[PDB]
């Protein structure tokens, strides 16, 4: 009924910090320091120290993912596990052995590796010493980390990503208190956003200097949720277009077009908060756009005029130009508090084909979180997560209008394969195709796993 | 009878390691370490620990130089004095205070500062830890240190130089045994020569991001002695061709034209000794040529065919393509071993005018050395150094020819103002317009000093 192009990749997505646990990890990332210092900030007091036991059970975990039909698995390498000395990027031996064990095990179970380099997991010591992503030195240290990954695993990994959603690091660490160090400072957030795009372009450059095969591509993973206007009222349209530029063009334009959006640059310049860039750095951005693009989508975003004039006496924040809008009539996932709107899939697909040269791209994250999935166990202990099947059917159907109209969309990656640790929310909401009983780290396929496996065999539903 | 353009600058040239002494210097450069462990390698046992006492006596020393007609003093800031932590380029407080005193004292004596950032004085710890200029990381540390110099002193310093004769570091440290660490490795020296051209271009880029005046200019100091063919025989013209590419084009073309000489790159590639470069690096080199040129010249250089074929089995060295030639009938400075040939001054001027856009340039070093000048002391303790006047006269007369033919030469700096420490030769040969008795650090003008002052007021002789 719905068919997908030949060679379409059917995948799942996690990260190292949300799965491995901290077993024998040399360094703390910001979340490990946060958890070890303020465990009360975490749901049920579950921190990342054990997560989903992937450090210990990766092999059998991969067997289960392959049964659920994971053809390609995307996860991440922790800067804080691979690296001994950050200034030098020397190798922690156990960390190197672990990631090789993981990659080899993926290829033993016929799972194609998709490796991302950074998923919100800055080493706390680099924050302490340089304030992390605010420091162009830390940007250089990341490239050095990235080179070590290219040299150690490039013989077996064709598909690479620099960052997963830099904007969430920008928002979490410097705007809204989501991430340790919980800084609230607009001007610093602007500098961080620039520095991460710069880290990204530098890593693409280093990758293309070292890559030997045509199959080897490096991309970036962004959330491209559109910023839908609340109404056709002019103040709402003005709010929607800044929020579009701020949330999407801020990273999409430099990563894919090689430049920042000039209207955004103009606005930050006039507000006095523009980042510090050099001509060399800008030239590096222009010269090293990504090969491909990972797209994350879960729920839409709608905006209206700000309550007060942006000329008001207040600390600068991107939010002075827009406020979120809840739409009367919205279809809702009520317990998670998110609108369901799979047509965003189709709009995103078209933005990419019309305004970004139809660059090769994939849905790298799409999924639905539900709390207390033990309510829906059947008598053999399998979650009857039909809601998650329905969810995937709605978003894939819109994605197929996506591809039928021309989108160079090359795969679909579910968040997630195995239930994994969602930062402060920990295991409140489960997204997996595969349940994890985190007390015993016992993993069981849910119903959606078998449907996802047949989806990949039929190449449709 | 022989006069110069309006506003021609009459200056003197030294460097920091040859004048200051090591008084309260936090770090050893390469020569400090070399002397501290092998003083027998240094003439009469004299190292750089006191030199010409400039750390203590800069004020009165600057008065004597002004008495001798020094309108512009070119010297250097030592990396090892200014910088506490090389990795961060944090400041040593006594080092900053000293160079502030020196620059301020220069102005109070009406001497225009010309500041060179590097004169063969690699910090020895960066050699031990990274192998120094071989490490593109050391390149980045240099840029950081250069930024500090601009930020601290740019407000009163308009004339900057990235390096003095990078080729002498390549030759001295990696080819012929002149400089600690005394490595003898052809391929390494090629990479070092690449890295210092890169470091210079990166330093031009940082200067221009931070320069706040039209008057502020940065350049590089190069010896541009022509490579004279021993004869018009093809084999001698071919050797002179390569020695010219290797001696001058290797630094001049990147610095002024923004690219390496493709004939040289062809030759090194064919010989498999080419440097490792990146597209990014070559673009920085292309984008930041110097503002001006400083030209060093003391004696000519003549070249014939190698004794044996370059296809012979021998370690790759630039010299496989050319041998130094001794012309019969040459005018010699016999004690020093150098030929006297002021006509080269004219040749240099014309080469810049005709093949380098007539970019603004100066003779930044020219001068004659003479051992044991006590022989020519008179009743006054004044060295009767008529030979140095004759030398200056002859080479100035050739310069004026170049100028009248239209070469954009704008000044002429004598080496040196005060007798200074000439590396392993230390104080064997004396070059100053002003003598230093190095036992008492008592400094007294020579006859040539008064004449240089009269040369300035008359703008000619």
GROMACS .gro file of N, CA and C in nm, chain A residues 87-88 129-130 137 140 144 205-206 209 278-281 284 288, chain B residues 87-88 129-130 137 140 144 205-206 209 277-280 284 288:
model
   96
   87UNK      N    1   4.395   1.733   2.568
   87UNK     CA    2   4.479   1.826   2.491
   87UNK      C    3   4.546   1.755   2.376
   88UNK      N    4   4.581   1.630   2.399
   88UNK     CA    5   4.660   1.551   2.308
   88UNK      C    6   4.576   1.453   2.227
  129UNK      N    7   3.762   2.399   3.268
  129UNK     CA    8   3.888   2.462   3.233
  129UNK      C    9   3.877   2.569   3.125
  130UNK      N   10   3.784   2.556   3.031
  130UNK     CA   11   3.774   2.652   2.921
  130UNK      C   12   3.634   2.706   2.898
  137UNK      N   13   3.950   2.683   2.150
  137UNK     CA   14   4.044   2.575   2.179
  137UNK      C   15   3.970   2.442   2.191
  140UNK      N   16   3.901   2.296   1.875
  140UNK     CA   17   4.015   2.224   1.818
  140UNK      C   18   4.031   2.086   1.881
  144UNK      N   19   4.051   1.695   1.708
  144UNK     CA   20   4.152   1.595   1.738
  144UNK      C   21   4.088   1.465   1.784
  205UNK      N   22   3.609   1.882   0.713
  205UNK     CA   23   3.736   1.902   0.643
  205UNK      C   24   3.837   1.795   0.680
  206UNK      N   25   3.854   1.770   0.810
  206UNK     CA   26   3.947   1.666   0.853
  206UNK      C   27   3.906   1.531   0.797
  209UNK      N   28   3.996   1.496   0.427
  209UNK     CA   29   4.139   1.477   0.410
  209UNK      C   30   4.181   1.333   0.434
  278UNK      N   31   3.612   3.489   1.239
  278UNK     CA   32   3.720   3.545   1.159
  278UNK      C   33   3.692   3.516   1.013
  279UNK      N   34   3.757   3.589   0.921
  279UNK     CA   35   3.748   3.552   0.778
  279UNK      C   36   3.793   3.409   0.750
  280UNK      N   37   3.903   3.364   0.810
  280UNK     CA   38   3.947   3.225   0.793
  280UNK      C   39   3.838   3.127   0.834
  281UNK      N   40   3.778   3.148   0.952
  281UNK     CA   41   3.675   3.057   1.001
  281UNK      C   42   3.556   3.054   0.906
  284UNK      N   43   3.637   2.854   0.611
  284UNK     CA   44   3.631   2.711   0.641
  284UNK      C   45   3.487   2.660   0.638
  288UNK      N   46   3.345   2.359   0.346
  288UNK     CA   47   3.331   2.222   0.395
  288UNK      C   48   3.188   2.185   0.436
  548UNK      N   49   5.095   2.689   2.603
  548UNK     CA   50   4.972   2.631   2.550
  548UNK      C   51   4.856   2.731   2.553
  549UNK      N   52   4.855   2.818   2.651
  549UNK     CA   53   4.750   2.917   2.666
  549UNK      C   54   4.796   3.056   2.623
  590UNK      N   55   5.888   1.857   2.337
  590UNK     CA   56   5.758   1.796   2.355
  590UNK      C   57   5.687   1.770   2.223
  591UNK      N   58   5.708   1.855   2.124
  591UNK     CA   59   5.641   1.846   1.994
  591UNK      C   60   5.738   1.837   1.877
  598UNK      N   61   5.089   2.203   1.567
  598UNK     CA   62   5.039   2.255   1.694
  598UNK      C   63   5.127   2.367   1.745
  601UNK      N   64   5.027   2.681   1.594
  601UNK     CA   65   4.911   2.745   1.654
  601UNK      C   66   4.948   2.816   1.784
  605UNK      N   67   4.903   3.231   1.882
  605UNK     CA   68   4.851   3.279   2.010
  605UNK      C   69   4.944   3.382   2.071
  666UNK      N   70   4.700   3.685   0.915
  666UNK     CA   71   4.555   3.681   0.934
  666UNK      C   72   4.515   3.736   1.071
  667UNK      N   73   4.586   3.696   1.178
  667UNK     CA   74   4.547   3.745   1.310
  667UNK      C   75   4.576   3.894   1.324
  670UNK      N   76   4.283   4.096   1.150
  670UNK     CA   77   4.161   4.097   1.230
  670UNK      C   78   4.169   4.199   1.344
  738UNK      N   79   5.032   1.905   0.348
  738UNK     CA   80   4.948   2.024   0.353
  738UNK      C   81   4.802   1.983   0.346
  739UNK      N   82   4.715   2.078   0.378
  739UNK     CA   83   4.572   2.057   0.367
  739UNK      C   84   4.516   2.166   0.279
  740UNK      N   85   4.401   2.143   0.216
  740UNK     CA   86   4.336   2.252   0.142
  740UNK      C   87   4.314   2.378   0.226
  741UNK      N   88   4.262   2.363   0.348
  741UNK     CA   89   4.244   2.476   0.440
  741UNK      C   90   4.373   2.557   0.455
  745UNK      N   91   4.459   2.958   0.359
  745UNK     CA   92   4.509   3.061   0.450
  745UNK      C   93   4.632   3.130   0.390
  749UNK      N   94   4.636   3.558   0.282
  749UNK     CA   95   4.701   3.652   0.374
  749UNK      C   96   4.846   3.679   0.337
   0.00000   0.00000   0.00000
